[PDB]
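Quick one before lunch.
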Amino acid sequence: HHWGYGKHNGPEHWHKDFPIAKGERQSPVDIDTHTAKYDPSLKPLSVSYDQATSLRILNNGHAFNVEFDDSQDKAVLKGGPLDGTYRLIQFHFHWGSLDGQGSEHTVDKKKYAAELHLVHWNTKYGDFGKAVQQPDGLAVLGIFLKVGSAKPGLQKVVDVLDSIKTKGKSADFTNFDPRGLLPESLDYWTYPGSLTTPPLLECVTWIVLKEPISVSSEQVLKFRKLNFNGEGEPEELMVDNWRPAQPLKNRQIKASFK
Ligand code: NI
Ligand code: NI
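Model of the nickel (II) ion complex:
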């Protein structure tokens, strides 16, 4: 709770507390769409969110986390590059100060206005805390946001943010359907990587959807009204909470589509 996104505590500093920041499988990365190899071996991706059950939303001083009840076999990601089954625990976003930046992954160096991360843990390790200690512990579905038409399924999120403005505030947040945040297509890129915030663990199979979602300007402007600070400290708007692209280091990015 000293790391952040600023000049003196941002991404270029994180390696001091977290040496893995300079590791061999760090995220995000630029997705070079011409270099990515179509992989006919990938099985169909399966997103089964019909029983997802949200519990709460928290401003953690970095982003806001929508946390789900993951105590039962509900809200599962499987197939694609995955072996076994991964359970949804939370989602969050990364976004910019301006529409021209905000995403963590880039596509041929293109930055989107924001990116959504749906975080799932491998059920073979029994819970999230043990899964993050394993190289195949997590599967994160990444979805790019562009500014245009509103996303009606985002509006419940946008409307609770005024209740969690500052670091440490949380609220009850039930019956949120994450299916309303998906694009039409499940075409994706996949590669082995890491968490994009400290502790930067190399435990993620990344699945980045090719098709962005559209959100309105007014929706992302409400993201940018959150605060990094806690109440009673100077106001610092919660913007630019994205780590830039890291070295690919001879990993391969595979495409699900030709
Ligand atoms: Ni700290
Ligand atoms: Ni993230």
